[PDB]
Design an enzyme around this catalytic site. Sequence first.
Site, PDB file in Angstrom:
ATOM      1  N   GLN A 119       0.944  -1.308  -0.242  1.00 47.68           N
ATOM      2  CA  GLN A 119       0.228  -0.294  -0.501  1.00 47.68           C
ATOM      3  C   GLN A 119       1.098   0.829  -0.023  1.00 47.68           C
ATOM      4  O   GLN A 119       0.561   2.643  -0.552  1.00 47.68           O
ATOM      5  CB  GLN A 119      -0.569  -0.083   1.195  1.00 47.68           C
ATOM      6  CG  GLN A 119      -0.182   0.227   2.829  1.00 47.68           C
ATOM      7  CD  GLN A 119      -0.031  -1.944   2.786  1.00 47.68           C
ATOM      8  OE1 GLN A 119       0.143  -2.516   2.421  1.00 47.68           O
ATOM      9  NE2 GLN A 119      -0.242  -1.943   3.906  1.00 47.68           N
ATOM     10  N   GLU A 174      23.967   3.630 -17.339  1.00 46.02           N
ATOM     11  CA  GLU A 174      25.497   3.951 -16.774  1.00 46.02           C
ATOM     12  C   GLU A 174      25.422   4.047 -15.319  1.00 46.02           C
ATOM     13  O   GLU A 174      25.406   5.521 -14.302  1.00 46.02           O
ATOM     14  CB  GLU A 174      25.409   5.045 -17.519  1.00 46.02           C
ATOM     15  CG  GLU A 174      26.439   5.746 -18.622  1.00 46.02           C
ATOM     16  CD  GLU A 174      25.084   5.240 -19.823  1.00 46.02           C
ATOM     17  OE1 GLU A 174      23.850   5.216 -19.475  1.00 46.02           O
ATOM     18  OE2 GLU A 174      25.560   5.278 -20.550  1.00 46.02           O
TER      19      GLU A 174
HETATM   20  N1  LIG Z   1       7.112   7.481   5.204  1.00 45.70           N
HETATM   21  C1  LIG Z   1       6.341   7.170   4.573  1.00 45.70           C
HETATM   22  N2  LIG Z   1       6.484   5.876   4.640  1.00 45.70           N
HETATM   23  C2  LIG Z   1       4.967   4.730   4.743  1.00 45.70           C
HETATM   24  C3  LIG Z   1       3.791   5.668   3.607  1.00 45.70           C
HETATM   25  N3  LIG Z   1       3.031   4.180   3.599  1.00 45.70           N
HETATM   26  C4  LIG Z   1       3.503   3.540   4.781  1.00 45.70           C
HETATM   27  N4  LIG Z   1       4.744   3.624   4.929  1.00 45.70           N
HETATM   28  C5  LIG Z   1       5.797   2.685   6.009  1.00 45.70           C
HETATM   29  O1  LIG Z   1       4.409   1.378   6.397  1.00 45.70           O
HETATM   30  C6  LIG Z   1       4.802   1.195   7.519  1.00 45.70           C
HETATM   31  C7  LIG Z   1       3.675   0.228   7.911  1.00 45.70           C
HETATM   32  O2  LIG Z   1       3.465  -0.640   7.953  1.00 45.70           O
HETATM   33  P1  LIG Z   1       3.164  -0.940   6.032  1.00 45.70           P
HETATM   34  O3  LIG Z   1       4.105  -0.431   5.331  1.00 45.70           O
HETATM   35  O4  LIG Z   1       2.018  -0.784   5.778  1.00 45.70           O
HETATM   36  O5  LIG Z   1       3.056  -2.259   6.223  1.00 45.70           O
HETATM   37  P2  LIG Z   1       3.426  -2.958   4.477  1.00 45.70           P
HETATM   38  O6  LIG Z   1       4.879  -2.330   3.988  1.00 45.70           O
HETATM   39  O7  LIG Z   1       2.243  -2.476   3.678  1.00 45.70           O
HETATM   40  O8  LIG Z   1       3.661  -4.818   4.916  1.00 45.70           O
HETATM   41  P3  LIG Z   1       2.269  -5.963   4.872  1.00 45.70           P
HETATM   42  O9  LIG Z   1       2.216  -6.130   6.611  1.00 45.70           O
HETATM   43  O10 LIG Z   1       2.188  -6.995   4.687  1.00 45.70           O
HETATM   44  O11 LIG Z   1       0.952  -5.056   4.451  1.00 45.70           O
HETATM   45  C8  LIG Z   1       5.981   2.650   7.777  1.00 45.70           C
HETATM   46  O12 LIG Z   1       6.778   2.343   8.876  1.00 45.70           O
HETATM   47  C9  LIG Z   1       6.210   3.201   7.061  1.00 45.70           C
HETATM   48  O13 LIG Z   1       7.269   3.373   6.838  1.00 45.70           O
HETATM   49  C10 LIG Z   1       3.982   6.815   3.782  1.00 45.70           C
HETATM   50  O14 LIG Z   1       3.708   7.583   2.928  1.00 45.70           O
HETATM   51  N5  LIG Z   1       4.769   7.483   3.768  1.00 45.70           N
HETATM   52 MG   LIG Z   2      -0.313  -3.942   3.140  1.00 44.01          MG
END
Ligand SMILES: Nc1nc2c(ncn2[C@@H]2O[C@H](COP(=O)(O)OP(=O)(O)OP(=O)(O)O)[C@@H](O)[C@H]2O)c(=O)[nH]1
Ligand SMILES: [Mg+2]
Lengths: 280, 430, 36, 100, 434, 57
Positions: free
Chosen positions: E11, E249
């Site tokens: 997501q 590159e």
């Molecule tokens: N900086 C930033 N980080 C985000 C954003 N959206 C999600 N994240 C990252 O998402 C983490 C929270 O867990 P998710 O990324 O939602 O979990 P996932 O990567 O989807 O993995 P799953 O559990 O399998 O869904 C946070 O630690 C963020 O680093 C964003 O819009 N900005």
């Molecule tokens: Mg997810």
Amino acid sequence: MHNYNVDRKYQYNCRIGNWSEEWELDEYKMKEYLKNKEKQKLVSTDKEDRLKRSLGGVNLSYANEGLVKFGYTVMIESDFMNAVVASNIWDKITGTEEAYGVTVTSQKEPIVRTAFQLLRYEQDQYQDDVIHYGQNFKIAVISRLSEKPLYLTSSHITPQKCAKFSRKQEVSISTNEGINSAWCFEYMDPKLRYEMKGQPVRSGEPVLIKHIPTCQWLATDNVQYNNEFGQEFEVFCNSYQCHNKTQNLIAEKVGRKTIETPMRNQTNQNTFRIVTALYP
Amino acid sequence: MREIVHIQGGQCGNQIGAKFWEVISDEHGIDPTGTYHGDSDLQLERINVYYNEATGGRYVPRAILMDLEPGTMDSVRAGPFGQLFRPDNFVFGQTGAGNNWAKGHYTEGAELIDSVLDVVRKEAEGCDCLQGFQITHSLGGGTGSGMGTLLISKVREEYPDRIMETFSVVPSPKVSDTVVEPYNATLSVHQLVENADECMVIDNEALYDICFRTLKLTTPTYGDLNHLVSAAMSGVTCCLRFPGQLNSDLRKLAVNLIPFPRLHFFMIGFAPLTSRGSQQYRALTVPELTQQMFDAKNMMCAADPRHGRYLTASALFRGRMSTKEVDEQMLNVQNKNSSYFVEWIPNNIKSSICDIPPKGLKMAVTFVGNSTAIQEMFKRVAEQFTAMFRRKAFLHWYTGEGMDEMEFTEAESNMNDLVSEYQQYQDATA
Amino acid sequence: SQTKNPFLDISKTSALLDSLKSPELSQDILSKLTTI
Amino acid sequence: DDLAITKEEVKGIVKTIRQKLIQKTKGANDEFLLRKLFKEFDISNSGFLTLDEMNAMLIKLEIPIQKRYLNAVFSQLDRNHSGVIEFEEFVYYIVNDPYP
Amino acid sequence: MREVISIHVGQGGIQVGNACWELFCLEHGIQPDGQMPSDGDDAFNTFFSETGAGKHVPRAVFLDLEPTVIDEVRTGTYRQLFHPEQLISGKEDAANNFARGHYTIGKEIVDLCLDRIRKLADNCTGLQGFLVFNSVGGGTGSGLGSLLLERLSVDYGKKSKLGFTIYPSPQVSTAVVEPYNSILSTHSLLEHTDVAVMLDNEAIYDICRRNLDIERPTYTNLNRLIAQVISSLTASLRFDGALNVDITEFQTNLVPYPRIHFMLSSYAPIISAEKAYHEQLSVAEITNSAFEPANMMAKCDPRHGKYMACSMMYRGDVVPKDVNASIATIKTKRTIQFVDWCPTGFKVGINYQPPTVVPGGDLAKVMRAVCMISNSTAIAEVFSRLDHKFDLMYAKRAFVHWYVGEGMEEGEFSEAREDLAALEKDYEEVGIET
Amino acid sequence: TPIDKEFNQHVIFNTQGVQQHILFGHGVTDYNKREYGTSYDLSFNQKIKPQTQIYSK
Ligand SMILES: Nc1nc2c(ncn2[C@@H]2O[C@H](COP(=O)(O)OP(=O)(O)OP(=O)(O)O)[C@@H](O)[C@H]2O)c(=O)[nH]1
Ligand SMILES: [Mg+2]
Ligand SMILES: Nc1nc2c(ncn2[C@@H]2O[C@H](COP(=O)(O)OP(=O)(O)O)[C@@H](O)[C@H]2O)c(=O)[nH]1
């Protein structure tokens, strides 16, 4: 250092303790009552309105020479049940289509909801306006009760479709426009049932009702019913034929008699009598 | 689309459910007649989560009522929004529980659970991909704990793939209501630790205590106690029903709310709960939120949240807001609680962002956490259990319906070990 | 208590072993071969 | 006049569009699809349709109805002829109709 | 004649791609509805594809097992923007479980993603490379992104890969299971990618704060900044300039040894329009801003070690002579030192095109900008920070079983820690003099 | 006791009836205002300034 919930308590009028805290909660209702008053959703404003329109002024049309004719707003009374057929638009029957329940009422004061219309059901040879026995006709509701034209109708027996209380074939006030609307009068005297065909019908003479799609008599029985408009009885179609059997089989082969003339007495509980207004 | 089911039973279990659906409808916008009259666009894209689809005339709430007597059911039907439940899911016995667990699980429930198992599976197979089960019941109640748990017991055997939550209401020693509260509850707690995935308990004593302290209501009625929870419980799935920045499902909670496999007992509190006192005098801002959410008297548990250490905690933030505070608020709170937060498992706080706000509120906080204090309740009940069992008080009518004292001996050892196992980690140091 | 020690014992057996590998997994990508 | 609409063609066209909707979502649904689309655009909320939305409403769910053919269906559906239609009744004929 | 297929898993990746898509479309004049208004030109082929009818379908694939992420996109205004089936939608999310996103529910969906990618590459013939964003501390992103990382290397082989990953925030984080999924993703993603990039959230936080004075920034602005960077690398790819750099590159100018493929990039200047009036915004002065720690886009201090590589890309109205002069200024400063064995590591290109500002954005309109991507041993601490956390909570076997029940091998955890120590030292040995 | 039915509706809603009034135990001058807004629903399409969001009023 003030303490709360000190055993016995007064009313919020006195400021002994916790008075202001309860006051606002007490005061809020009107404020919430205000906004619910802002939009028309109060039940009290709902219950009364139904009585007003339903009890709206109704004037039954006159009867000339006792010759009831299509168009004259007439009532339907239960001679044996001493009540007038009443309709309801609010309550909804358990029917996917739009049909509405019916109720027979003892009160005989004239009200619109107890008025119907007898409009010619089908073009026929009888172009003269006097209704003739066995000439198709339909029950029509007054235009004041509901916006859409409403017709009383009934369907056949069914384990799934059955009377709520009587457990017989139900009579439905719906908007369907098919076979289910027709009806035809028939003289009360069993013997005269044959040579009344095509004869004039006179206001004030007892009238029975039967369903041409199904051949069942519409009558009323001493069964209670519940609705807003006080207490009332039910309406349904059935044949309360005298249970005594008649050996019709030997009548045919011997030929003494024909099927047309009925040999089975029909009791009073089916008795209906059309009545017109008191004055012209 | 990954919907959960609801199976409510018992005098306590059904009463809670009556409030929840009303809360769910209000948020989701369905009138008493079952027709939809919502406003926002997003409220017509997920009604499947807690409502089915039927003929054009209504949406059928997938509900089941289980109880041994008819009187308790007869009230729910006459209650508002009682037209929602389909009659077919109506199952009711004529014998009554009598607050006897054995009668509720061995003798009578056997020849009534067959149908309830029949109905549940039928409802169970209706879904495309079931998301889980969430049974509301009372362990201290005769009808629930026995009959209620067995329904749970069968579910675990037949569907080891889905997850399960438990909102159970346990009796606290200070407030006593049933003379058999100690025993019947004890037999109940045995079958959950080995079968339940997520368990968050609710105490009657708190629900009263929060009201007069925070709300300060003179004479609150059951509707208040029930009403609060219904909204609160629906706060767990907020990210599961509507759009959100950081989608978080219960399983995410299960993985991120359970330290060890036998550590799935939960207690919860809700914020911001504001009394009628100063509604217009207060500003609802994140700094105010986090401050209230850690209040020891806001949680729905009787155990003191300051006599142990916090293992895991998660809140599904509600409404539109900026992340900085959320990251800053917890990090601000977390470090300032060096005495009450475990260390060998760092970063013991989760956050979520589901934009949809509950009606009438802009900031809403729903809290869940696994706290070491929970065992403090266990001591009180257990200590009661040992005292009342030594003399065989009332035991003979927990043995005369076909069960012998052996299991009693087995169970009582279960709590003591369960309490102990949860205390050793209290002093566990890397 | 019966199942407590066996679960804790094995992990410590591995856990101590696990910490052993990390120093043992130390290969410094041709430490002195850069100048060699 | 070039020609007059024939009933059978009325049977097919009504049938033709009818079967078109069955190709949407699940069998359990496909009445909410007709209800839900209506709800999106109705300021009055009373339940009175007109020609344009009908030609439009057919437009959304791939219903290319011809103008002269367009008029044939509308009248047949309504015995009121007052230029209005009941949505519940209008839905009723499309699906809740045992007889052709 | 160069086209790149973009990849976004999870997501968060979907959000970042969404945010970068508005800017990408705007910088080329394509309307949101899929038709460029009537007016190097019209050569949008670099990021989009033409049937010849007017549309412009992006060459991107969206994957997710959680319907919430892509339900909105299919519900947004751009509903016509993306190919309908090109966004595979999953049913049940990985729930932050690496094994579940890698060993139980990822397999039955992986084939679908592979088929779509295979189909897309058919149209293009000079595909520069693949762009992938994934969450290392995020479950669905790790496994789904990880598995594709394994397949592509065998689906195509030598084809390069550019990974833009977002490691967990150093101090304030959301998830707790991140130390596991980060190490496993770090363990696996290592040997199936060409280069990496640092994307910690706190760095974007403070950059937005002290620059935009935004006490309440959200993820949309972070994604906006990220996209601005994404526009940076490819800028020379679809804009005429005397000095141009292509994806091919990258292994030649940012890899001293094959294993070391983790780079940290920075972008600037980030200034609110309310403060640019009293600023000259000279090309030379912005040169300094890109090298001190506070402007770095990752929570790292380069002063803890030498510098191994640094690639600078310039676009605007700059002049090459100033580039050497200002760069010559940097070599004077003693606060920044390279390794003993890297005499030349500067890679500078010139692109005339200026950055494009999307309506409603935060950054003001400027004439000069630069993107900083330097290879420095300063990455040593980041893994160690994760290293301490990974051991602390595992030595008690906390959360151990939730992984095992999905098929994840118990010994697999041992190796994961095995690599993290190995990677840490590799940066260590390259910091000593001859 | 005449107990007019009209009072029952009026008495219950003023005199501490055993119910609650439509989730007003969670209330916070006029508040129905069913609010709802997400990032991509408004931000990326409506081009609402990032600082404009939040902004309680
Ligand atoms: N900086 C930033 N980080 C985000 C954003 N959206 C999600 N994240 C990252 O998402 C983490 C929270 O867990 P998710 O990324 O939602 O979990 P996932 O990567 O989807 O993995 P799953 O559990 O399998 O869904 C946070 O630690 C963020 O680093 C964003 O819009 N900005
Ligand atoms: Mg997810
Ligand atoms: N808070 C709260 N507790 C309740 C309610 N109804 C029952 N209880 C609790 O349930 C206990 C008795 O439950 P019981 O009658 O045995 O439930 P049953 O087995 O389903 O009939 C009492 O101690 C109450 O505290 C309620 O509406 N609210």
